[PDB]
Amino acid sequence: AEIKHYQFNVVMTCSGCSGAVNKVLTKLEPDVSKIDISLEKQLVDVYTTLPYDFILEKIKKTGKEVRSGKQL
Numbered sequence: 720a721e722i723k724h725y726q727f728n729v730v731m732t733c734s735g736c737s738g739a740v741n742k743v744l745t746k747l748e749p750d751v752s753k754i755d756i757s758l759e760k761q762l763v764d765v766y767t768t769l770p771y772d773f774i775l776e777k778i779k780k781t782g783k784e785v786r787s788g789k790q791l
Contacts, residue, residue: 720768722752724791727763727775730784731756739781747777 731737737756740763744754753766765774771790779785 722766722768723771725765725767725771725774725788726791727765727778727788728761728786729763729778730786731758731761731763733783736783739783740778743777743781744774747774 729736729740731740737758740756741754744751744765747767747769750769751765751767753764755764756762757764763778767774771788775785775788
């Protein structure tokens with residue numbers, strides 16, 4: 720199956736916010752292969768076989784502001 724690369728600008732200028740994002744992604748193992756969170760750029764990179772819309776909805780349901788997303 721394709722391992723897609725999604726990138727999101729997520730506002731994580733808040734205590735616990737990067738961890739909230741990590742957590743929802745851990746629940747989607749074993750079909751999430753890699754995640755990167757950069758506080759220097761406020762970016763979350765997700766490498767996964769799962770659909771974009773599903774990753775986006777799960778990140779949004781953390782209540783953290785998702786400014787934009789891309790498939791790369």
